[PDB]
Amino acid sequence: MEEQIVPFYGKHQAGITTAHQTYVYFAALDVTAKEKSDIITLFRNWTSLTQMLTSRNQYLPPQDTGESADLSPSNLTVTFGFGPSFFEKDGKDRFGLKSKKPKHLAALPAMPNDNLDEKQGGGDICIQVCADDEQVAFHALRNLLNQAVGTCEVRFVNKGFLSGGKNGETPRNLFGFKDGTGNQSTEDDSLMNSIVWVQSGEPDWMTGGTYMAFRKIKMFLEIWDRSSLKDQEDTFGRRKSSGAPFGQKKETDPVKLNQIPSNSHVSLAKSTGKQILRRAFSYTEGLDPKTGYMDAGLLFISFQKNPDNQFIPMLKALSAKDALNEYTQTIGSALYACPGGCKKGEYIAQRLLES
Amino acid sequence: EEQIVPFYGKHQAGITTAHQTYVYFAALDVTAKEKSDIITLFRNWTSLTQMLTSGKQRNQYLPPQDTGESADLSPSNLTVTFGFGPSFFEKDGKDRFGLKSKKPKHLAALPALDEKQGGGDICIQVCADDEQVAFHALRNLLNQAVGTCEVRFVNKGFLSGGKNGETPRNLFGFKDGTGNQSTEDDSLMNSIVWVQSGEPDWMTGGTYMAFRKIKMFLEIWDRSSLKDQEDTFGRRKSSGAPFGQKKETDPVKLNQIPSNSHVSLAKSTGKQILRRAFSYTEGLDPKTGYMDAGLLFISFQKNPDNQFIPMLKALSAKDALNEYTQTIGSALYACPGGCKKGEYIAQRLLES
Ligand code: HEM
Ligand code: HEM
Ligand SMILES: [Cl-]
Ligand SMILES: [Cl-]
Ligand SMILES: [Cl-]
Ligand SMILES: [Cl-]
Ligand SMILES: [Cl-]
Ligand SMILES: [Cl-]
Ligand SMILES: [Cl-]
Ligand SMILES: [Cl-]
Ligand SMILES: [Cl-]
Ligand code: NA
Ligand code: NA
Ligand code: NA
Ligand code: NA
Ligand code: NA
Ligand code: NA
Ligand code: NA
Ligand code: NA
Known part of the structure; x- marks a missing residue:
């Protein structure tokens, strides 16, 4: 087979019109940090890692978790999105993003059929990880989520x-x-x-x-x-x-x-x-x-x-x-605003978070 | 058809068979009270597993016999492995279907656990190189067992x-x-x-x-x-x-x-x-x-x-x-030897 790689940098985020892979891990996270600088670090750390994923001191923990070492990239894509709660939570505007809030980002209206579990929806940040191999998808999500400990709490993880x-x-x-x-x-x-x-x-x-x-x-x-x-x-x-x-x-x-x-x-x-x-x-x-x-x-x-x-x-x-x-x-229900694509050299959501 | 593992043979498949990528692992309790229901269960499971693993009209006003979601998928080296827990032979002192005289000699629950996460009369291990293929196999096997068994847990x-x-x-x-x-x-x-x-x-x-x-x-x-x-x-x-x-x-x-x-x-x-x-x-x-x-x-x-x-x-x-x-969770199951074409899984145990 040819290389099973999907471009990470471009006009758009991958994982949307990318051809449908076989497996998904879908996670929502809530930001517990109170400073936008912590989120900036998160997204540039996420960007570099995702670029690596999609493409010597033994007394220290391994930088990578190791379980996809021998595996193909398997058309891995990682898609990031922002929930309404990222912009306004508990009646207060967060991180100073009012001027940059999207037009249509609100929770979806309540339907009478619904039996919605609040913990099965929402979230400040969503991460959609897709690959043609489940172990590859989990490895990608796990390493991305490892970066967010300290800054976020995971709300739910579906696959x-x-x-x-x-x-x-x-x-x-x-x-x-x-x-x-x-x-x-x-x-x-x-x-x-x-x-x-x-x-x-x-x-x-x-x-x-x-x-x-x-x-x-x-x-x-x-x-x-x-x-x-x-x-x-x-x-x-x-x-x-x-x-x-x-x-x-x-x-x-x-x-x-x-x-x-x-x-x-x-x-x-x-x-x-x-x-x-x-x-x-x-x-x-x-x-x-x-x-x-x-x-x-x-x-x-x-x-x-x-x-x-x-x-x-x-x-x-x-x-x-x-x-x-x-x-x-x-x-379960959620709506997320997915940023435009990332240019190489820049980081995901840089135009939103940067001063 | 290349990605086909033989179902009939000296042994059950899925044991020394090359390790596939995906597994569904289910445990069932027998709720039927008559041994004749268990024999038909295992005969029907044998025919259905042979169909499921080998690849391989009906009226539209009836339920489909197959659930359909593997129709365009390769068999994907599907194997299905059956085992019996101790409770299949005696539960709460009772000899349930006259089988205790044929109990295996080393089938005792492992010494010291979530009990809803172990045990069961029957286990089914379903392995395939595609997750959808494996769920489809388990789902159709479990559908055949309604009325005779209840599902205890499903891990994948x-x-x-x-x-x-x-x-x-x-x-x-x-x-x-x-x-x-x-x-x-x-x-x-x-x-x-x-x-x-x-x-x-x-x-x-x-x-x-x-x-x-x-x-x-x-x-x-x-x-x-x-x-x-x-x-x-x-x-x-x-x-x-x-x-x-x-x-x-x-x-x-x-x-x-x-x-x-x-x-x-x-x-x-x-x-x-x-x-x-x-x-x-x-x-x-x-x-x-x-x-x-x-x-x-x-x-x-x-x-x-x-x-x-x-x-x-x-x-x-x-x-x-x-x-x-x-x-x-923990469980130990006794897996019957292989099934010869013409016979059914565990026939030698159930026929007596
Ligand atoms: C378990 C839930 C659902 C199942 C099993 C399901 C399944 C299907 C199937 C089998 C089709 C026909 C083939 C196709 O065009 O894909 C279809 C069409 C479609 N469904 Fe769903 N669907 C579900 C939920 C939803 C929901 C929640 C929405 C929107 C709110 C939706 C929107 C659509 C649309 C837009 C089409 C294409 C209609 C067209 O031909 O223009 N589906 N779905
Ligand atoms: C989460 C639990 C476990 C993990 C992560 C794990 C992983 C491993 C690894 C990495 C090895 C070395 C490479 C290999 O030979 O495969 C190994 C060896 C082995 N493990 Fe485990 N294992 C687990 C549970 C168990 C249990 C519960 C048993 C037995 C009750 C067991 C029995 C063995 C045996 C027999 C070997 C080979 C030893 C030999 O070289 O003779 N493992 N396992
Ligand atoms: Cl790229
Ligand atoms: Cl495209
Ligand atoms: Cl537009
Ligand atoms: Cl608009
Ligand atoms: Cl834990
Ligand atoms: Cl969860
Ligand atoms: Cl050795
Ligand atoms: Cl689960
Ligand atoms: Cl499952
Ligand atoms: Na049409
Ligand atoms: Na290596
Ligand atoms: Na999961
Ligand atoms: Na007993
Ligand atoms: Na279960
Ligand atoms: Na252990
Ligand atoms: Na035999
Ligand atoms: Na045979």
């Missing part, structure tokens, strides 16, 4: 997986359906600018950036597995094996809305007329300690340049009447 | 070997596996792993599986000196060589390593096992707010009383590794 098809087929979620068809092509720069990338109207540090929505969505695999193929397909409006819209021959044929249930998932999301870039991963977390049922679902991640215009209307349309709600439950 | 894990065939590294960053004999050396695996005498005949060609869920304190480990890390094991970190030797594969000179090092204590027992462990991570430790991670320690041995319990004894008292680890 997930999503295997694309052997022949390049659209990857399937835990319900067995191709997941990602409705995305536009990430190699179409024009469409990514219109959907994902902030181009103007925001602070300089957010230009070339995007907003990341995070929803941890439990999936009721047991009752889904007892449901008929027809019910499963009716839930989505696509046929399970082909991923083709109802009444169509191929996965990539256009959805015909008059042929699918109006409460189906695809119909409702298509109804808004809005677009986002989904980049989710499945998770399994053993058995629910309470119910003794399998804990599994979707780490739903999507990017959009304007979440108020593109993402909240989807939540509203789905939270109302989505057939998928029978089989899912949102238990 | 990972262990990536080097691209250059290098020995895989655990989460402390040390090569892990060097002390194992070659799993391709049939005579050595016969001597260490495979049962051919001293057990009921369904155990012939089988083995005992030891499972230990061992928490690894990564935060304090990563803050410990490289010399302290090496002194813990008695091998150098990058090369994996025993102290005083050049190569990973050089013999261990016990005079050159601390008497309380992990390698010294285990080797000086004179005993040997076949270790086939996987790393794990499971979110944050709430008591400390640091990463909850560890080793899913899995070993195979023909006689745990002779080969494994001596190691547990020597390490539990004096191992320097105990400073950085804590055992959270």
Whole structure:
């Protein structure tokens, strides 16, 4: 194989329109330090380390933890984002960043379907670590988090997986359906600018950036597995094996809305007329300690340049009447502003944090 | 089809099979009360495992027989290994299905742990080079067992070997596996792993599986000196060589390593096992707010009383590794010998 490296420095952060890797570690952190200088050091230390990750005194602790020494970089990417709590917490503006706060960075509105665990969402800082090998992804996250002890406390850490098809087929979620068809092509720069990338109207540090929505969505695999193929397909409006819209021959044929249930998932999301870039991963977390049922679902991640215009209307349309709600439950939620890309020589979020 | 491991044979796959990258490890309790339900369970598991591992119409108004998420994936060297805990033969004094007369001779819970994190009547170890493939296999196996078993726990894990065939590294960053004999050396695996005498005949060609869920304190480990890390094991970190030797594969000179090092204590027992462990991570430790991670320690041995319990004894008292680890769960399972095509897993035990 060729080198499995994704460029870290550029106009954009990697991990967004980068091709979807197989594994993710997703962590949220809260800043406990009270001085912006500590955060500056964090982000320049994170930048140098991430550049190393993505590319003699025995009485001292090893600088690196060592468990990816013999492994390929496996298309490792690290994406950083800022939560609303980074800018304002407990009624006070932090670190003097009011002038630089993004337009659309607020917590997502409360939906009635939600069973949100506050500790499973939010966070001042998110770190999305993706690679085609789970040990590589964990190694990257662990070394990054090792730098933040002293400055931050980790809020939560999730991990997930999503295997694309052997022949390049659209990857399937835990319900067995191709997941990602409705995305536009990430190699179409024009469409990514219109959907994902902030181009103007925001602070300089957010230009070339995007907003990341995070929803941890439990999936009721047991009752889904007892449901008929027809019910499963009716839930989505696509046929399970082909991923083709109802009444169509191929996965990539256009959805015909008059042929699918109006409460189906695809119909409702298509109804808004809005677009986002989904980049989710499945998770399994053993058995629910309470119910003794399998804990599994979707780490739903999507990017959009304007979440108020593109993402909240989807939540509203789905939270109302989505057939998928029978089989899912949102238990975690967060929104993060992902900075524009980093130039070599500079550090992540330098335009935001620097005086 | 290249990434296919044979399911039928003299032995169960997943033991001397080359170590795959991902594991799901489940324990089930039998809730059915009639032995005929257990036989159909194992017959159906045998057919389904044969389908799942080999790669390989129905009406849309019925539930799909398969859950679908591995449809476009390679078999990925999927193996599925079955074992029985002591409770499968007697629980609370009762002989449950007339099987106690066929109980294995060394199947007693390991002497002193979270009990919800060990035990069980049945274990299933599912290994594949792709995590989605392994979950799909376990999920469909567990779906077949509803009504007859309840799932006790599910752990999962990972262990990536080097691209250059290098020995895989655990989460402390040390090569892990060097002390194992070659799993391709049939005579050595016969001597260490495979049962051919001293057990009921369904155990012939089988083995005992030891499972230990061992928490690894990564935060304090990563803050410990490289010399302290090496002194813990008695091998150098990058090369994996025993102290005083050049190569990973050089013999261990016990005079050159601390008497309380992990390698010294285990080797000086004179005993040997076949270790086939996987790393794990499971979110944050709430008591400390640091990463909850560890080793899913899995070993195979023909006689745990002779080969494994001596190691547990020597390490539990004096191992320097105990400073950085804590055992959270423990179980011992008896794995049946292999299944011949036409038969079913544990037929010789269940048919009587
Ligand atoms: C466990 C939760 C979810 C599952 C299993 C799921 C699965 C799917 C599937 C199978 C499709 C059809 C194939 C595709 O185009 O990818 C789809 C489409 C889509 N879903 Fe989801 N989804 C989930 C949650 C969400 C949420 C929370 C949102 C938005 C708030 C969302 C937005 C969309 C969009 C925008 C599409 C493409 C619609 C189009 O064709 O234009 N999904 N999803
Ligand atoms: C988190 C827990 C553990 C870790 C991190 C760990 C790691 C290691 C490492 C790095 C080595 C040296 C390289 C090798 O030969 O593989 C080793 C050797 C070994 N370990 Fe462990 N191990 C753990 C638990 C255990 C347990 C619980 C046992 C037995 C009850 C055990 C038995 C052995 C044996 C038999 C050897 C080979 C000794 C020889 O050279 O003859 N290990 N282990
Ligand atoms: Cl670069
Ligand atoms: Cl967590
Ligand atoms: Cl691209
Ligand atoms: Cl814009
Ligand atoms: Cl977990
Ligand atoms: Cl799991
Ligand atoms: Cl705007
Ligand atoms: Cl800890
Ligand atoms: Cl040796
Ligand atoms: Na369409
Ligand atoms: Na008993
Ligand atoms: Na569990
Ligand atoms: Na090395
Ligand atoms: Na984890
Ligand atoms: Na231990
Ligand atoms: Na046999
Ligand atoms: Na055979």
